[PDB]
Design a protein around this ligand. Structure first.
Ligand SMILES: *NC[C@H](*)CS(C)(=O)=O
Ligand SMILES: [Zn+2]
Lengths: 340, 602, 75
């Protein structure tokens, strides 16, 4: 009947998408330090003397509240009795300003909120770097969530290749065909696909519509791979509530332009509980490794983040529950892998 | 699904290839060569050296790339496979189409022939192989007679090559499935599945008895298969890139290969260390056809992605180097000249004229409405020519341009065909009046004015050349009907039109009911009484000025004072009075939302 | 130009668009080929959602650029 040092958030309405993303992103390898550096820059700039900086200030306030509340729990356990949680009022108001979609208390997507937060951080950071050069921390989203993609297309008439270099924040992945593994799904995203029939490549070499083969390869690799599982199909729209096998270690050497020995270890899963695309409940599970030997007692164990309660789960139990051997009732939606 | 009307701007006679050649057939008896081009014309050539002009005839009924042709019945009949999904039977002695086979759902890539059984197979991207008996393809029309089809099933991916032996007992298909599939065309029985290729197979050959097969793949390997033992006996690696064309002598001991690396070799099958580099080509090799008038073949005909078909002498084939570099022949012996393909196109602002650049870097000026060429501008800069002919006008898109055949094909679709309402003065015509003209309507009444169902002839302003191909097709390449503009009066063409022409064409052309005027709404408010207005896309700013002056501030001709009293602004730009609202909203309106105009007194 | 959209199952479809085409037109074409209502669609190019009211030129979407189609898993 005792709480845990690690601190969650509050429902505050219908805020479970945002809480899940925030508890995932608070445990990223270098998100906290980067946001603290950016806030140091913004604080210095303000002392030298905006809407864009409001997100960074809100994130810094949230993070400082989380960590100071956890510390206060560690040295004054009896000061808190029922729940150990905070509330992102400021951050929700900030996102609500920076995106009117979040006006009110209605249910939203978690990947979209993660994308909004990351893009807003990136645009503030580019703006700040431009302001500085007018007068290593300026590449946080770019270094830690952004990777480069190579898209080869090969005409099957002339066999002439064309290269497109694009960018990606997330790896968007099917979960069923038109017991499957994550390797099968990444292959469906990035292995050779033939374009035939109604979909036909227009070749500027042939000046004609031809069958072609596309392949997607990975050129540059972010420190955190986020895999966005397409747990939804056009039946009129349904949710595919049957997860695929998710490895603890992942290697993207098969779909990489150059050979690499870089394993990725799973550390966070965002899960949607529901039978409908339009309603459900979001939950986040993260693996604790680093920030009081009590705090290191949890090393290697998984944390389940409901709205305000935190539960410690062993790795074997979490992996068994996530596996589609039994009905999980909460399908994985966002998979987070970090370099090793 | 959706039926489109297309036409081709071209000369009455197209003697020379306007694109690459996909296939070749030789007729030894008449000394006659057939070329199947990407320009959709099959051409007939003489191969007597003394004949100054080899051209004999042109065979014109396809609407897309002609991918393969087969001579059969002692050269009396030719069978053609095209990307218009059709297989056509021709009278090769005269040059007219007898029948069209519409059993394929996609591009038809391959044709195979069995000499002794008079049997032809057709395969394509729709994964289907159809077996035909040439003697029963003497059918004139569907009403007159009908034919039944046999099919071979098993392909899990698109077929790019076919092969039957002379005896007609083995048929082999090559696909991007990477595996060769073998049938018995007599009983349509699946026999084998040969494995070993790593890429697409675009060349297949069989000997007379159908016991061996040569396969050339896009991975660069030539494999010789034993169909009795279901195995690959030998592999030959002679090409740095894909092998696209294969040929073999009668004894089936030497193989002539060519592909994407523009080289042609002659490899001994029973001792591959000896190979001779026949020639270096200028474009990738698509097909090869031996002159089979001698026991060791005396020549070879090569078709490339260029429009020139060359013949290379093989005299001198007999050295010691494992990989010789010197080619046997540096120059071709017989050359069939080719034309230039329109490669780049630009529709001008009036949406009536086109600028094209071809392979010889010549720029031409075209009139789409009259389906003619206005002038040749020479080897002038294409983009400088585009900028030189900029005009401050907006006309909505009403046609598409396709350059798949090396010729201008103009497609009309009901989504946008009637989107262009222009004035007679602004479109070159006249009356003492300036009526408002729909370009799609005028073009449709010009393309099928020889149709008796459209008479009371034509639009009264222009005519297309009578030799203009008018094509009725589907979005996807499936051609429904093709005819020349002057053939619409015949009974057969009249019936095929009554069956094929869509109702959106019929309304404008047969029922003579005109399309809908398109209107844009626009705000009009003071500049240092506000009301929303809508009017045609075409009305001149003069009329908006007249509405503002005579009705908002109205406290010798009446219209004279209108132009010198009120001046109209859009985003702080004084508007040309003769400019229409389309142009304002397209160029001077770079903001988002509905167009807003402002007025001030002089 | 011709662009690519990777649909929900991973299959890639082809769209014929113009640089002056709004995202709403692209979603209409995707509805034509796939049946998903535009109000339920999310298009992602180079890690960015393509918000409505903006054209394809605003995002530097060139020939054979791949768009990713996802939906909103609301919670
Ligand atoms: N679907 C958003 C979350 C729901 S809740 C009940 O956790 O606020
Ligand atoms: Zn090509």
């Amino acid at each position: 009947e005792n709480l845990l040092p690690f601190v969650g958030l509050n429902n505050l309405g219908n805020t479970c998408y945002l809480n899940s993303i925030l508890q995932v992103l608070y445990f990223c390898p270098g998100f906290k330090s980067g946001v603290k550096h950016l806030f140091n820059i913004i604080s210095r700039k303000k002392e030298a003397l905006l809407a864009s900086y409001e997100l960074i200030c809100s994130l810094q306030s949230l993070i400082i509240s989380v960590e100071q509340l956890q510390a206060s729990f560690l040295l004054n356990p009896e000061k808190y009795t029922d729940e150990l949680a905070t509330q992102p009022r400021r951050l929700l108001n900030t996102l609500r300003e920076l995106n009117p979609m979040y006006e009110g208390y209605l249910q939203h997507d978690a990947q979209e909120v993660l994308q909004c937060i990351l893009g807003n951080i990136q645009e503030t950071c580019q703006l700040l770097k431009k302001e500085e050069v007018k007068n290593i921390g300026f590449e946080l989203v770019e270094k830690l969530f952004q990777g480069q993609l190579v898209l080869r297309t090969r005409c099957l008439e002339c066999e002439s290749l064309t290269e497109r270099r694009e960018d990606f924040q997330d790896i968007s992945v099917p979960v069923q065909e038109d017991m499957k593994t994550l390797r099968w799904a990444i292959s469906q995203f990035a292995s050779v696909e033939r374009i035939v029939g109604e979909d036909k490549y227009f070749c500027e070499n042939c000046h004609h519509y031809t069958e072609a083969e596309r392949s997607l390869l990975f050129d540059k690799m972010p420190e955190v791979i986020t895999i966005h599982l397409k747990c939804f199909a056009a039946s009129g729209l349904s949710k595919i509530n049957t997860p695929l096998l998710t490895p603890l270690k992942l290697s993207l050497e098969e779909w990489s332009t150059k050979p690499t020995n870089d394993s990725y270890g799973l550390f966070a899963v965002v899960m949607h509980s529901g039978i409908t695309i339009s309603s459900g409940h979001y939950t986040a599970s993260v693996k604790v490794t680093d920030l009081v030997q009590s705090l290191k007692e949890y090393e290697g164990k998984w944390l389940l983040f409901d709205d305000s309660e935190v539960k410690v789960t062993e790795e074997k139990d979490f992996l068994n529950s996530l596996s589609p051997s039994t009905s999980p009732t909460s399908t994985p939606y966002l998979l987070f892998y970090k370099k090793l | 699904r959706k039926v489109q009307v297309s036409y081709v701007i071209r000369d009455e006679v197209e003697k020379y290839n306007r694109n690459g050649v996909n296939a070749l057939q030789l007729d030894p008896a008449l000394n006659r060569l057939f070329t199947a081009g990407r320009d959709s014309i099959i051409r007939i050539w003489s191969v007597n050296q003394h004949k100054q002009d080899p051209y004999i005839a042109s065979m014109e009924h396809h609407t897309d790339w002609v991918n393969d042709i087969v001579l059969c019945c002692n050269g009396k009949t030719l069978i053609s496979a095209s990307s218009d999904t059709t297989v056509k039977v021709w009278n090769a002695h005269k040059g007219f189409c007898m029948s069209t086979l519409r059993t394929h759902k996609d591009y038809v890539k391959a044709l195979a022939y069995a000499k002794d059984k008079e049997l032809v197979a057709s395969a394509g991207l729709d994964r289907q192989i159809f077996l035909w008996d040439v003697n029963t393809l003497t059918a004139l029309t569907a009403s007159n007679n009908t034919v039944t089809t046999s099919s071979l099933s098993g392909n899990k991916d698109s077929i790019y090559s076919l092969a039957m032996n002379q005896l007609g007992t083995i048929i082999v298909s090559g696909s991007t499935e990477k595996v060769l599939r073998v049938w018995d065309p007599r009983t349509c029985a699946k026999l084998m599945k040969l494995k070993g290729h790593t890429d697409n197979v675009k060349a297949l050959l069989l000997n007379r008895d159908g016991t061996q097969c040569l396969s050339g793949s896009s991975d660069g390997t030539i494999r010789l298969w034993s169909l009795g033992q279901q195995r690959c006996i030998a592999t030959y690696r002679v090409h740095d890139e894909g092998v696209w064309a294969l040929q073999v002598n009668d004894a089936f001991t030497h193989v002539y290969s060519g592909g994407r690396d523009r080289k042609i070799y002659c490899t001994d099958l029973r001792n591959p260390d000896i190979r001779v580099l026949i020639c270096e080509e200028k474009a990738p090799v698509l097909k090869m056809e031996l002159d089979r008038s001698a026991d060791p073949p005396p020549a070879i005909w090569v078709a490339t992605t260029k429009s020139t078909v060359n013949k290379w002498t093989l005299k001198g084939i007999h050295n010691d180097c494992t990989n010789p570099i010197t080619p046997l022949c540096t120059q071709p012996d017989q050359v069939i000249k080719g034309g230039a393909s329109i490669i780049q196109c630009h529709i001008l602002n009036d949406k009536r004229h086109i600028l094209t650049k071809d392979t010889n870097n010549n720029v031409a000026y075209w009139d789409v409405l009259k389906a003619c060429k206005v002038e040749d501008l020479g080897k002038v800069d294409f983009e400088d020519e585009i900028k030189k002919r900029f005009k401050m006008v907006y006309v909505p898109n009403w046609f598409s341009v396709d350059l798949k055949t090396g010729m201008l094909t103009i497609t009309l679709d009901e989504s946008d065909c009637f989107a262009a309402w222009v004035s007679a003065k602004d479109a070159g015509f006249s009356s003492g009046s300036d009526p408002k003209l729909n370009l799609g309507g005028l073009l449709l009444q010009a393309l099928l004015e020889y149709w008796p169902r459209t008479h009371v002839k034509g639009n009264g302003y222009f005519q297309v050349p009578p030799h203009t191909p008018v094509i009725f097709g589907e979005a996807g390449g499936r051609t429904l009907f093709r005819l020349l503009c002057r053939d619409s009066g015949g009974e057969t063409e009249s019936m095929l039109l009554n069956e094929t022409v869509p109702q959106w064409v019929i309304d404008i052309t047969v029922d003579k009911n005109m399309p809908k005027f398109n209107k844009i709404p626009f705000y009009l408010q003071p500049h240092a009484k506000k009301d929303r207005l809508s009017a045609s896309d075409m009305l001149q700013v003069r009329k908006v000025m007249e509405h503002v002056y005579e009705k908002i501030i109205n406290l010798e001709d009446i219209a004279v004072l209108a132009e010198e009293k009120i001046e109209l602004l859009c985003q702080d730009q004084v508007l040309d009075p003769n400019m229409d609202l389309r142009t304002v909203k397209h160029f001077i309106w770079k903001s988002g939302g509905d167009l807003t105009l402002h007025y001030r007194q002089k | 130009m011709q662009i690519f959209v990777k649909t929900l199952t991973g299959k890639t479809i082809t769209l014929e668009v113009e640089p002056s085409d709004t995202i709403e037109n692209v979603k209409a074409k995707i509805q034509d080929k796939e049946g998903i209502p535009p109000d339920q669609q999310r298009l992602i190019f180079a890690g960015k959602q393509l918000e409505d009211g903006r054209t394809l030129s605003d995002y530097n979407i060139q020939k054979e650029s791949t768009l990713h189609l996802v939906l909103r898993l609301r919670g």
